[PDB]
Point group: C2
């Protein structure tokens, strides 16, 4: 009786008889997490060792002790992006309030499928997304939806555009004569190809446009590509403008692209998954000029807003387009004026991600977020200043965000020797000061990429890193030759 087979703390009994055991277990977990996270800076950003002993469920439930030991062992070997010496990827330190809100949401166990399941979260999400859309420059007719990652947002926007221009919602793409074409920058994200493939358009449907030296779209090249594809059998219907590309973090000229698309009557989609956070900065918001011309926007607050994963949204200039092109009246649930979020979304059941974003915005505030963005820009400006004044160092392009991609180009060394030199420098930096630099391959060459997101990285760290770089250059065998 009273569930004697289950462990005394398997569930939180609604009556509340086992409150003491639940409290003790929660306290143990909280203490372990606090101890692990407090000493993040001491541990190296990356660990080479990995664990591979899983996939054997026990017949008898293991006690809380032992489980805690295994959890601690797993945690020690996990990736460590919380240390200040991790400036290689877009992952950064998340706000504490967001993590606590995520825990609260998991404990509540509500659902975003319908309003009945989320009486308050649905309205909160609607209002918060409306405020964000207003901040991007849209009117009251604009409307958005939250998804799990920017890939789903891109897929939803492309599907809506395809349905609106071709009206294949109920028939399909088999009867169409000319293949639709989507034009994208040659430095665009890899999710565009997957989205095009999943919609039946074809992986080869995406047509790449040339970019200038700063990894920005070339408007004349875009016009030439549009004309060349029109003369052929295919017909263009969408143009994708990327703000904050993946590698160099550059921003396309959205204003000219929007003008061209309006001239040719194409659907303009803006992918500001990283650059969107600029709308929270008074000084640097103008870098996104013309974003109000796009027919849809993809935004990821989890990147530059320090919100625990995952938080991502897609915004549309017109709500009726989402209500008609995407929505299907097949479901016959209870009639309610409020539109269920599962009908106009790619996925039906979704975890309530609005709470963490709302809590983060309330706790930090607008001014603090503006200050954080300004500090990141200051760090990137100092990094760029240090990169110059060194003949052997060259920049891929002038930065537009807190991302800087640079490389070493010894005069005597050739391309392969330069790549080996860059890889050796990355390894040396990682092993000496525990500073992590990503090593992407752009334009056929390896570049050391640094994303400056950690608020605790000081200028002295950058100066010490560059001093170590100079020491490595002087001590390397190439200089002797």
């Amino acid at each position: 009786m009273n569930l004697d087979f289950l462990p005394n703390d398997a569930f939180i009994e609604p009556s509340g008889q086992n409150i003491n055991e639940v409290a003790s277990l929660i306290k143990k977990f909280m203490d372990l997490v606090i101890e692990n996270s407090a000493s993040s800076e001491q541990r190296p950003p990356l660990s080479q060792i990995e664990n591979y002993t899983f996939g054997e469920f026990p017949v008898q439930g293991i006690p809380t002790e032992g489980i805690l030991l295994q959890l601690k062992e797993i945690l020690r070997n996990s990736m460590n992006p919380l240390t200040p010496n991790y400036i290689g990827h877009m992952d950064s330190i998340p706000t504490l309030i967001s993590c606590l809100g995520e825990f609260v949401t998991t404990t509540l166990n509500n659902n975003m499928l319908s309003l009945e399941m989320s009486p308050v979260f649905s309205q909160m999400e609607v209002q918060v997304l409306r405020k964000i859309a207003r901040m991007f420059g849209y009117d009251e007719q604009s409307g958005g939806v939250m998804v799990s990652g920017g890939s789903l947002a891109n897929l939803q926007a492309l599907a809506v555009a395809r349905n609106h221009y071709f009206s294949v919602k109920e028939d399909g793409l088999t009867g169409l004569i000319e293949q639709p074409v989507i034009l994208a920058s040659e430095a665009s994200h890899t999710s565009l190809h997957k989205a095009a493939m999943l919609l039946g358009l074809g992986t080869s449907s995406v047509v790449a446009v040339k970019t200038n030296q700063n990894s920005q779209m070339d408007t004349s090249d875009l016009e030439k590509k549009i004309n060349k594809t029109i003369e052929e059998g295919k017909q263009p219907f969408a143009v994708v403008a990327t703000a904050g590309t993946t590698v160099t973090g550059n921003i396309d000229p959205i204003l000219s692209i929007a003008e061209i698309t309006k001239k040719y009557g194409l659907w303009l989609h803006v992918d500001a998954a990283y650059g969107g956070a600029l709308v929270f900065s008074d000084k640097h918001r103008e870098r996104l000029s013309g974003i109000e011309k796009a027919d849809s926007i993809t935004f990821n607050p989890q990147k530059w807003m320090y919100v625990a994963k995952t938080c991502a949204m897609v915004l549309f200039k017109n709500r009726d387009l989402l209500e008609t092109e995407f929505r299907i009246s097949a479901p016959y649930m209870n009639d309610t004026d409020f539109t269920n979020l599962g009908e106009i979304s790619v996925q039906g059941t979704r975890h309530a991600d609005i709470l963490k974003l709302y809590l983060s915005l309330q706790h930090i505030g607008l001014k603090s977020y503006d200050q954080l963005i300004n500090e990141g820009y200051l760090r990137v400006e100092e990094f760029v200043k240090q990169v110059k004044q060194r003949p052997y160092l060259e920049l891929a392009s002038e930065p537009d965000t807190n991302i800087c991609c640079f490389r070493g180009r010894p005069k005597n060394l050739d391309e392969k020797q330069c790549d080996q030199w860059n890889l050796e420098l990355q390894q040396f930096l990682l092993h000496k000061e525990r500073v992590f630099f990503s090593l992407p391959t752009y334009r056929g060459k390896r570049w050391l990429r640094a994303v400056l997101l950690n608020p605790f990285t000081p200028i002295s760290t950058i100066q010490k890193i560059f001093k170590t770089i100079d020491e490595f250059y002087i001590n390397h065998h190439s200089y002797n030759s």
Copy 2:
């Protein structure tokens, strides 16, 4: 200096200077959550009041106090599925260890985009999904991937099938002559239509097949539909078998469907989002006989396994099909033997959901899950027994899972009067004993639907609701007439 603009507990400093403030805030949040969840049974399962004052971000960060007040006021008005008197929907009480694991994963802030970002979680997920696939009856060639909800799993399976049969991965669906057809049961989930629409096949591509009295697919009707669609221009390519339908929770005859699909060479896809948990029950696993014949399976551990949302996976009989049909070699990240989970998935960045499932399996064990499933079946059997022996009560169909849909059919009342009687009975039951019954519309009539997932619901409760039903029937004005 030292981030004087931010609140003292906005982030967990890697150095560890503000450990005391972080600990105090975490303790406050834990105490609030424990207090709220302990008294879940006292609060009614549903609350009519909703909050609508959001969407105004503060210029200055509010202190932790006040934020806690607003958080608790929000919590009090949230839906309450943790009470034993909530048997209306598939939502239930989640395991505590899963919630704690979710909190730990959020604190770690790793990523499933690539192995480097999740050195251990990737391997853990691969091994756990392999074990689950082996438990469904697949061989070593089988392979799975976790997504966010069953809708994404259905979309991925349908996309893989379409690419495999038609080879439109690089060209598109415009050149095809005959429209592809997918045959589904008339009681199938609404996500099939959305998946068909998103893939360019067409919302009308899905062809509905008749069902017997028990809401199960009719094999002869399936064969007739296949022949009739073949004679026409269209050509079938996939057949969808649903285990544990949404309304009545019935299971289709997967063995005969698989035999027919093999005879006609179609892709069989099994959607066991709810029924899949039966593979953890020794006594009732045989209800899923023939599931090993399917070319893909969609499973949702979050429903019948009491895992905090969201946890869902899709399994494939062949890994090479996923490696070829779905994977695109466009990304040029670091070369590694281990395949990145973002290339073979609909979404790139995903929160680590494997940890909560692994922790739940370790803490509870296999025997405890078997016992929980058996107890649910016992409750449903008692519910069915009580439903009979009452002339005015009729069952939609004989249950196959812990879901029972029944209704009241007074002899004198007509259809509209019967529907009004059912709605009034639902309201009366909700208002007297705080017992929540869902009110779906099936076959043109409203049915009181009860999903028995709460482990703390005893038989005496069922007897009490049935006595209340008898009292309502006797006291209703229809009986006097």
